[PDB]
Design a protein around this nucleic acid. Sequence first.
RNA 1: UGUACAACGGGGUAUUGUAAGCAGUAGAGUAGCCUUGUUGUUACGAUCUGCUGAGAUUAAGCCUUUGUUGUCUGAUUUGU
RNA 2: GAAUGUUACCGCAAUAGUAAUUGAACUUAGUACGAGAGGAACAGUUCAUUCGGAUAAUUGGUUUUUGCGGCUGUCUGAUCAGGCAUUGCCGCGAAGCUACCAUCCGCUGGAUUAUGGCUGAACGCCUCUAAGUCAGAAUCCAUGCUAGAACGCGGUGAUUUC
RNA 3: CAGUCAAGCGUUCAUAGCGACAUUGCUUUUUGAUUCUUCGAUGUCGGCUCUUCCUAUCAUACCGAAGCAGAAUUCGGUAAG
RNA 4: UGAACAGCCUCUAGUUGAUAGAAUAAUGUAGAUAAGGGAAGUCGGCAAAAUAGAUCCGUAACUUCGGGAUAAGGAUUGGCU
RNA 5: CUUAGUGAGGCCUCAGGAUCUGGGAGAAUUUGGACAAACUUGGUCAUUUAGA
RNA 6: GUGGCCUACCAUGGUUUCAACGGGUAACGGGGAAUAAGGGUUCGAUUCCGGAGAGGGAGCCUGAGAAACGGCUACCACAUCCA
RNA 7: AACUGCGAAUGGCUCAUUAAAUCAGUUAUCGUUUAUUUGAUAGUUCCUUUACUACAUGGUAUAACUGUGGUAAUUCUAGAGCU
Lengths: 98, 170, 136
Amino acid sequence: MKVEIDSFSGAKIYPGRGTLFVRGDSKIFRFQNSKSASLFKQRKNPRRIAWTVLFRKHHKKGITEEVAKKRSRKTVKAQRPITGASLDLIKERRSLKP
Amino acid sequence: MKLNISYPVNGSQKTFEIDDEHRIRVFFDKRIGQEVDGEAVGDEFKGYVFKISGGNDKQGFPMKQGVLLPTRIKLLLTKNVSCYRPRRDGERKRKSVRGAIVGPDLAVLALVIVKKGEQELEGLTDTTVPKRLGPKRANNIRKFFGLSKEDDVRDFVIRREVTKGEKTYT
Amino acid sequence: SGNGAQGTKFRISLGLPVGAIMNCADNSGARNLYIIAVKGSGSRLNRLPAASLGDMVMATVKKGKPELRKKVMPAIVVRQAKSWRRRDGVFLYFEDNAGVIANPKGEMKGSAITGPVGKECADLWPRVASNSGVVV
RNA sequence: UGUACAACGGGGUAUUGUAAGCAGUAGAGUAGCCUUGUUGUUACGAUCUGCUGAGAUUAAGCCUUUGUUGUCUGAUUUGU
RNA sequence: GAAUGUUACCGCAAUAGUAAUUGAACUUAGUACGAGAGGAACAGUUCAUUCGGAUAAUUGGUUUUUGCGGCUGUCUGAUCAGGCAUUGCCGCGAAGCUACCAUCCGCUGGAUUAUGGCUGAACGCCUCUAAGUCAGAAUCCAUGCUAGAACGCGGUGAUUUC
RNA sequence: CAGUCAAGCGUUCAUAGCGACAUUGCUUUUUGAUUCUUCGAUGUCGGCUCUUCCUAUCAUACCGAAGCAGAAUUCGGUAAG
RNA sequence: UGAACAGCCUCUAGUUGAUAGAAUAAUGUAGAUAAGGGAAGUCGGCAAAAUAGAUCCGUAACUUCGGGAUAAGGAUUGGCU
RNA sequence: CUUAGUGAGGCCUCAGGAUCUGGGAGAAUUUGGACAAACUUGGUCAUUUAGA
RNA sequence: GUGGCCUACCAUGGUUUCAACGGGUAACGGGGAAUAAGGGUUCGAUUCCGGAGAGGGAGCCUGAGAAACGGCUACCACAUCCA
RNA sequence: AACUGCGAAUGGCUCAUUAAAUCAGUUAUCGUUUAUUUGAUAGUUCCUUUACUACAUGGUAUAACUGUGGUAAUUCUAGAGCU
Ligand SMILES: [Mg+2]
Ligand SMILES: [Mg+2]
Ligand SMILES: [Mg+2]
Ligand SMILES: [Mg+2]
Ligand SMILES: [Mg+2]
Ligand SMILES: [Mg+2]
Ligand SMILES: [Mg+2]
Ligand SMILES: [Mg+2]
Ligand SMILES: [Mg+2]
Ligand SMILES: [Mg+2]
Ligand SMILES: [Mg+2]
Ligand SMILES: [Mg+2]
Ligand SMILES: [Mg+2]
Ligand SMILES: [Mg+2]
Ligand SMILES: [Mg+2]
Ligand SMILES: [Mg+2]
Ligand SMILES: [Mg+2]
Ligand SMILES: [Mg+2]
Ligand SMILES: [Mg+2]
Ligand SMILES: [Mg+2]
Ligand SMILES: [Mg+2]
Ligand SMILES: [Mg+2]
Ligand SMILES: [Mg+2]
Ligand SMILES: [Mg+2]
Ligand SMILES: [Mg+2]
Ligand SMILES: [Mg+2]
Ligand SMILES: [Mg+2]
Ligand SMILES: [Mg+2]
Ligand SMILES: [Mg+2]
Ligand SMILES: [Mg+2]
Ligand SMILES: [Mg+2]
Ligand SMILES: [Mg+2]
Ligand SMILES: [Mg+2]
Ligand SMILES: [Mg+2]
Ligand SMILES: [Mg+2]
Ligand SMILES: [Mg+2]
Ligand SMILES: [Mg+2]
Ligand SMILES: [Mg+2]
Ligand SMILES: [Mg+2]
Ligand SMILES: [Mg+2]
Ligand SMILES: [Mg+2]
Ligand SMILES: [Mg+2]
Ligand SMILES: [Mg+2]
Ligand SMILES: [Mg+2]
Ligand SMILES: [Mg+2]
Ligand SMILES: [Mg+2]
Ligand SMILES: [Mg+2]
Ligand SMILES: [Mg+2]
Ligand SMILES: [Mg+2]
Ligand SMILES: [Mg+2]
Ligand SMILES: [Mg+2]
Ligand SMILES: [Mg+2]
Ligand SMILES: [Mg+2]
Ligand SMILES: [Mg+2]
Ligand SMILES: [Mg+2]
Ligand SMILES: [Mg+2]
Ligand SMILES: [Mg+2]
Ligand SMILES: [Mg+2]
Ligand SMILES: [Mg+2]
Ligand SMILES: [Mg+2]
Ligand SMILES: [Mg+2]
Ligand SMILES: [Mg+2]
Ligand SMILES: [Mg+2]
Ligand SMILES: [Mg+2]
Ligand SMILES: [Mg+2]
Ligand SMILES: [Mg+2]
Ligand SMILES: [Mg+2]
Ligand SMILES: [Mg+2]
Ligand SMILES: [Mg+2]
Ligand SMILES: [Mg+2]
Ligand SMILES: [Mg+2]
Ligand SMILES: [Mg+2]
Ligand SMILES: [Mg+2]
Ligand SMILES: [Mg+2]
Ligand SMILES: [Mg+2]
Ligand SMILES: [Mg+2]
Ligand SMILES: [Mg+2]
Ligand SMILES: [Mg+2]
Ligand SMILES: [Mg+2]
Ligand SMILES: [Mg+2]
Ligand SMILES: [Mg+2]
Ligand SMILES: [Mg+2]
Ligand SMILES: [Mg+2]
Ligand SMILES: [Mg+2]
Ligand SMILES: [Mg+2]
Ligand SMILES: [Mg+2]
Ligand SMILES: [Mg+2]
Ligand SMILES: [Mg+2]
Ligand SMILES: [Mg+2]
Ligand SMILES: [Mg+2]
Ligand SMILES: [Mg+2]
Ligand SMILES: [Mg+2]
Ligand SMILES: [Mg+2]
Ligand SMILES: [Mg+2]
Ligand SMILES: [Mg+2]
Ligand SMILES: [Mg+2]
Ligand SMILES: [Mg+2]
Ligand SMILES: [Mg+2]
Ligand SMILES: [Mg+2]
Ligand SMILES: [Mg+2]
Ligand SMILES: [Mg+2]
Ligand SMILES: [Mg+2]
Ligand SMILES: [Mg+2]
Ligand SMILES: [Mg+2]
Ligand SMILES: [Mg+2]
Ligand SMILES: [Mg+2]
Ligand SMILES: [Mg+2]
Ligand SMILES: [Mg+2]
Ligand SMILES: [Mg+2]
Ligand SMILES: [Mg+2]
Ligand SMILES: [Mg+2]
Ligand SMILES: [Mg+2]
Ligand SMILES: [Mg+2]
Ligand SMILES: [Mg+2]
Ligand SMILES: [Mg+2]
């Protein structure tokens, strides 16, 4: 069970919903409802039709908290040395100086 | 599906096989680079935070960070790109690619550990595996060791033993 | 359906009444298929027999190589455009009415099928599984 | 005379697809006064943007309500 | 819908109407049969046709929701918001209605027919028949379904005082 | 449209399937013959629609027969659900 | 507005005369729209649908050389500056 | 050959910014172009050709 | 890189009976070949030179150099393997 | 093994297009690009210009490799750890 989305508007297409359009070039278009789907056949350009996902995304609308910082980073610092040359004698001689 | 988890602090790796929809479904609609908390996936992994790194669907096609889409798309790839190794000078090829968005169409989700859980995982935090090759360029030795352009390298290089049987060589 | 069709066929919206013209979609010579009967059709005073996906019909060719014109022959609707609906809730429709010419056994006359093909048609005539590019 | 009923008002749900107003270094461009401009200034210009997925409509056979206001004995008949 | 006290509720069932149809793929089985060529069927499964009764979650249709938006001509000085063009024109458009264009559902017992038989005389033999009797059909009667006799019926509640 | 006799057809074998000469019937969607009813008027082909009925059954149910090996067919019974 | 005494809207002038009220069943009359197919309907495309202005480009058979010809087939069209 | 219509794809360009470093790199993505295959429909030229 | 190569603005030019333009070519061009009075006629896909193509078109990456095909990319026509 | 460099634009094959095109003989670059081969060709690079700038030589990121994987299937390749 997959929710699909509207290849014109961008809205989730819950099971058994709307209309699916297999075009001549074999590219499929799923429309949630006949509004997008006719707006589609009318050769309308979704980046011009306000209420769509694509129009918004492109017009920087409402996003606010995705352009907000997060907090994901670690701190490692562990040692393995080199395979074939005693991993013991590579932290004693690794006592460094400056 | 299968999880290919890497432990990159220890350089350890191991797979795990997870049936049960709700257990998996924690990865769904997550993208490459999104971190996942671990108790959702199991109770061994309780705590462990996984950043999602790559992985292949059935039929074997690879993922590709930066595509979006939970589908496959056929792309033009070049030198200096993932899932493409060019056979010839300035050779581009048009190849299928799977999206960075996990779905249940995957056989293997590639995961990199970022934070350890309250419990050890056996083939990952129990076992530690060495870095194969050590510093070779001049200054790099001086930085793996911290030596000042004084201490003279020569003797700070690594020396890998191996035996002729009765002759053990350096 | 009928002769040499391994499989059944769950009912699908009938979009092709006798006299419809579907594009010829194989490399046979034909430009179009003009449906004159439907195999396995029903009988009811004044209904037209009507084809859908992966039915076998009987058409003549209106446009095509003269050696293919003015004669009756089997054909198989491979693309619908009158939207039908599957047992998974989806109402899907192609962009054209189109089928490929065949024999009673259900073997094609060209060596390919240009354009897509619905699955229900392909799940039904093996030789169409052969020649199909992108199914559904 | 009450988990009363109604008129509104509120909340949901749904339709359309961004209201009026005001603002703007958006705008092919255009006028006018000189203090003729090292953005000169005052306005005007289809359209564009922002406040604004806003505004408008949403039971008339949608849902719902602690709110507001109101309503709660007119008429006729019936017997083994 | 008057009248069999009034009114109400729950029921009974006379009589009557009645409904389901046909095909295929798998499988059986390349099987029995056949020198071969050829080549079935019963049980099982999956779908279909014709028909019928519903139904509106979905998909489609419909649009005076004159709901939103758009466009022409004009009239209100402009602005705002609007009037007229027998519903001006266009896209979208809920609700309702609605479509094998959409979805769901369409029951199982008995009795028999032809026909094959049992036992068995007539007629020391023989005979499915004479007496008696088994099996039997898209038939018939039921079960089921729709009415409910407005002069067929039952159970039950309450039954008026100025 | 259906019978009776059965000379013949059917390799053989009258009647599996047919059947001459003859002869017996039935039916009333043929066509005739008749002119009883209607000429102070029964609207007059075909189709569309839609209902119902008949059976001399094309299909579907279950059968008997075969010149039925099988598959196909054929003759026949109960049958108009 | 527009080619216009066309259609549509308006000033002047003149009307607001045509039983009424409540609903919005079947069937109608009049005005409409329908997925896919596209005359398979039917005596017959009956009806209905489609076309349509202008600027431009392009334009066949045949001809009484006058035509056939808006033949056919195309593109274009607001606003504002 | 070619009108008209539709138009792949790389290229140029307005944008984009998964990430990944020091204003820069940079994928999916996308605007506008030139180039332009190709499909549909017609026309045209050449060369063939069935036929009572 | 010269250049209507292309774009803008501008003029109205350019070729032709001394045959333009168009059609044909079972036409790649040349070195050459066959035929021996001479003049000629006929021929050259084909070992050397130039050119064009890599199934038909276009597009391009890399590069000193390709519009390359025993390189990519798109479409058209072919056509292969499969779970 | 792999990286890096160079080569894969030569060769070989065919004659389909091609009729002022190609090709030929003859010119032109005062009209431009050129790997290579050959010969030449380089004291200048920092900075308010004494408390100086790694020159005794400044940076990381990768292949191969290890190890974990995916697909019926290709000279497919992903995640991780090195140099
Ligand atoms: Mg709708
Ligand atoms: Mg619609
Ligand atoms: Mg009819
Ligand atoms: Mg459809
Ligand atoms: Mg094949
Ligand atoms: Mg395939
Ligand atoms: Mg009130
Ligand atoms: Mg807005
Ligand atoms: Mg506003
Ligand atoms: Mg304001
Ligand atoms: Mg009502
Ligand atoms: Mg309130
Ligand atoms: Mg009394
Ligand atoms: Mg029936
Ligand atoms: Mg078999
Ligand atoms: Mg066989
Ligand atoms: Mg035999
Ligand atoms: Mg129902
Ligand atoms: Mg119905
Ligand atoms: Mg609806
Ligand atoms: Mg409408
Ligand atoms: Mg309006
Ligand atoms: Mg206006
Ligand atoms: Mg204003
Ligand atoms: Mg008025
Ligand atoms: Mg009027
Ligand atoms: Mg009107
Ligand atoms: Mg409009
Ligand atoms: Mg209705
Ligand atoms: Mg159905
Ligand atoms: Mg039905
Ligand atoms: Mg059923
Ligand atoms: Mg029942
Ligand atoms: Mg029962
Ligand atoms: Mg009984
Ligand atoms: Mg018995
Ligand atoms: Mg016996
Ligand atoms: Mg006797
Ligand atoms: Mg008996
Ligand atoms: Mg008896
Ligand atoms: Mg007897
Ligand atoms: Mg029955
Ligand atoms: Mg009942
Ligand atoms: Mg009675
Ligand atoms: Mg009565
Ligand atoms: Mg009663
Ligand atoms: Mg009674
Ligand atoms: Mg009673
Ligand atoms: Mg009683
Ligand atoms: Mg006779
Ligand atoms: Mg005789
Ligand atoms: Mg005999
Ligand atoms: Mg005999
Ligand atoms: Mg004989
Ligand atoms: Mg006899
Ligand atoms: Mg008689
Ligand atoms: Mg009679
Ligand atoms: Mg008769
Ligand atoms: Mg008389
Ligand atoms: Mg008479
Ligand atoms: Mg009379
Ligand atoms: Mg009369
Ligand atoms: Mg009469
Ligand atoms: Mg009468
Ligand atoms: Mg009369
Ligand atoms: Mg015999
Ligand atoms: Mg036999
Ligand atoms: Mg047979
Ligand atoms: Mg019988
Ligand atoms: Mg009947
Ligand atoms: Mg009867
Ligand atoms: Mg006028
Ligand atoms: Mg009147
Ligand atoms: Mg009137
Ligand atoms: Mg009235
Ligand atoms: Mg009506
Ligand atoms: Mg229609
Ligand atoms: Mg249509
Ligand atoms: Mg048409
Ligand atoms: Mg026609
Ligand atoms: Mg007719
Ligand atoms: Mg007809
Ligand atoms: Mg007809
Ligand atoms: Mg006529
Ligand atoms: Mg006539
Ligand atoms: Mg017509
Ligand atoms: Mg008429
Ligand atoms: Mg007409
Ligand atoms: Mg229309
Ligand atoms: Mg004409
Ligand atoms: Mg036209
Ligand atoms: Mg314009
Ligand atoms: Mg394009
Ligand atoms: Mg440019
Ligand atoms: Mg793109
Ligand atoms: Mg000829
Ligand atoms: Mg001829
Ligand atoms: Mg130049
Ligand atoms: Mg001129
Ligand atoms: Mg001239
Ligand atoms: Mg001449
Ligand atoms: Mg040639
Ligand atoms: Mg020559
Ligand atoms: Mg030559
Ligand atoms: Mg040749
Ligand atoms: Mg040269
Ligand atoms: Mg070849
Ligand atoms: Mg090439
Ligand atoms: Mg080769
Ligand atoms: Mg080559
Ligand atoms: Mg071609
Ligand atoms: Mg598989
Ligand atoms: Mg190399
Ligand atoms: Mg060469
Ligand atoms: Mg780096």
